[PDB]
């Protein structure tokens, strides 16, 4: 009864929807950012530009759901 | 900001 139905929480597969929507890879999940207003998951280095840190600040928006 | 999981120190 996997968590995922898209990836069945195969650790073998990339998935961009429970793991970095960007690249897919799962591992760092202590630094994949969550969007708050889309949910997805994004590791701090596949963000143009590359963040080395969690922002400080509570909310934080994607590349897909931020103000431009 | 949230992120997905956290890591022990
Ligand atoms: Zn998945
Ligand atoms: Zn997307
Ligand atoms: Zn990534
Ligand atoms: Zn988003």
Same mark, same amino acid.
């Given at each position: 009864?996997?968590?995922?139905?898209?990836?069945?929480?195969?650790?073998?597969?990339?998935?961009?929807?429970?793991?970095?929507?960007?690249?897919?890879?799962?591992?760092?999940?202590?630094?994949?950012?969550?969007?708050?207003?889309?949910?997805?998951?994004?590791?701090?280095?596949?963000?143009?530009?590359?963040? &080395?840190?969690?922002? &400080?600040?509570?909310?934080?928006?994607?590349?897909?759901?931020?103000?431009? | 900001?949230?992120?997905?999981?956290?890591?022990?120190?």
């Amino acid at each position: 009864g996997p968590s995922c139905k898209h990836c069945k929480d195969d650790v073998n597969r990339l998935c961009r929807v429970c793991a970095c929507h960007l690249c897919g890879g799962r591992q760092d999940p202590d630094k994949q950012l969550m969007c708050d207003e889309c949910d997805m998951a994004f590791h701090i280095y596949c963000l143009d530009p590359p963040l &080395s840190s969690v922002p &400080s600040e509570d909310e934080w928006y994607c590349p897909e759901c931020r103000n431009d | 900001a949230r992120t997905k999981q956290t890591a022990r120190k």
